[PDB]
C-alpha cells in the first residue's frame with residue numbers, strides 16, 4: 354500500500370504545516386501537525402476541557418463506530434517550546450492520503466496548554482519519530498508509520514515541505530519526479546528515539562564550505578534551524594546589523610537586509626537553504642526588526658534540522674531494519 358497527502362503551511366511564515374487525517378467511522382477529518390520529532394498521535398476532542406478549545410476541530414469518539422477506549426491508558430507529553438497536553442486513549446481507524454491503519458492509538462486530549470488553544474489551525478499532532486518515545490502508559494503505543502510499515506510497498510515516508518506553499522507527505526514510495534539530482538542517504542542513530550544524523554558541514558552564502566560534524570535531528574515539528582553557536586554566529590556575522598537579542602530570544606536582523614543562503618552537508622552532497630527561507634518577519638507587528646530562521650541550539654541540548662532546513666530538500670525517512678535518512682535538492 355501507499356498514501357499521499359498534501360501538507361499546508363498554517364500561516365504566512367510557515368510556522369508549522371498541517372495535513373488532513375481521517376479518524377473514525379464515519380470519517381472525522383482533523384488537520385494534524387506531522388512531527389518527526391515526537392511519537393504521539395493526539396487530538397483535540399470532545400473530552401478536551403471546554404475553556405481550552407478555541408476554533409479547533411475536535412474528534413468525538415462516541416460518534417465513531419470503530420472507536421474503542423484503550424482501557425486504563427493515559428498519556429502526557431511536553432514539547433521543546435514548553436507546551437504540553439495529556440489525556441486518555443482510544444483505538445480507531447486512521448487514514449492519511451488513502452493509507453489506512455486499523456487499531457491506531459488516538460490519544461484524546463483532556464488538557465492542552467495555552468499555545469495549543471491559541472493556535473486555531475492545529476487540531477493535534479501525528480508523531481513520526483520512533484515508537485520508543487511514545488508516552489502512553491502503561492502500554493506504550495506505536496506510531497501511525499510503525500503500524501503501517503509492514504503493509505507499505507517500501508518501509509519509508511517522505512517529507513516535501515513547501516516554502517510559503519503546500520507540499521506533500523508520501524508513505525510507502527519515493528516520488529522520483531519530486532526532486533532534482535540524486536538522493537544522498539546518511540546514517541541514523543535511533544538511540545534517543547529521533548531521526549538523528551550527522552551533517553558533514555556548512556557554508557554561508559557563497560563562502561567556502563566548512564567540513565565539520567554536526568549531529569542533529571530531522572524534525573518536521575520544529576519551525577527553525579537550531580545549530581551550534583559557532584555556526585550561527587558565523588552566519589549572522591554576514592548580515593549587517595544582525596545581533597543576538599536576549600530580550601527577543603534569539604538573533605534578529607534589520608528587515609531591510611538581504612539574507613545570505615545557508616548550505617548544509619549530507620555526506621558529500623549539499624543542500625542550499627535560500628536566504629528568503631531564513632526570514633521570519635517582524636518580531637512584532639510593524640517592527641523593522643525581523644526574527645532569524647537560524648538560531649543557536651545552545652541550551653536545547655541537541656541540534657535541530659527543523660522546517661527551515663527540511664523545506665529546502667526532499668527528505669526520505671527510511672524505516673528499514675536499519676533506518677537511514679535521504680536528502681535531495683528540489
Ligand SMILES: NCC(=O)c1ccc(F)cc1
Pocket residue numbers: 386388390432433434435436478574575576
Ligand atoms: N521544537 C518542537 C516543539 O517545541 C513543538 C511544540 C509543540 C508541538 F506540538 C510540536 C513541537
